[PDB]
Design a binder for this molecule. Structure first.
Ligand SMILES: CC(=O)N1CCN(c2ccccc2)CC1
Length: 123
């Protein structure tokens, strides 16, 4: 149907926006601490601690499969990256502090993204 095509154009446009948002957020992780899944070879007990791991590469995979239907779903995954890190790692670690900085800086990008998604009506 034409409606289904219209919907898919919207989703494709959302994906384009979210890809821009994702690139901006990853730029706030210059140390690339959140670039890849935590290695279960390097941290064998990780899944005892963290029940829903997340990272930028996993997000990108979901993104390119157009698996984010709305900004909220994307934000949930970004929040998982930060929140998992701030639980597993203690306050006085380079890992925890990197998550705090990414959260604070990322907030700026997500604030405007929400306005853009609302404005261009992508949901
Ligand atoms: C995202 C996060 O929480 N990290 C980064 C990956 N980690 C790690 C530990 C040992 C060797 C290599 C990497 C654990 C802390």
């Amino acid at each position: 149907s034409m409606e289904q095509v219209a919907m898919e154009l919207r989703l494709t446009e959302l994906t384009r926006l979210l890809r821009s948002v994702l690139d901006q957020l990853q730029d706030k992780d210059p140390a690339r601490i959140f670039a890849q899944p935590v290695s279960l070879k390097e941290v064998p007990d990780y899944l005892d601690h963290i029940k829903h791991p997340m990272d930028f590469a996993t997000m990108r995979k979901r993104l390119e499969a157009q698996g984010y239907k709305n900004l909220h779903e994307f934000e949930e995954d970004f929040d998982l990256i930060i929140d998992n890190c701030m639980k597993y790692n203690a306050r006085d670690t380079v890992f925890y502090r990197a998550a705090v900085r990414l959260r604070d800086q990322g907030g700026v990008v997500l604030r405007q993204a929400r306005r853009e998604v609302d404005s261009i009506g992508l949901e």
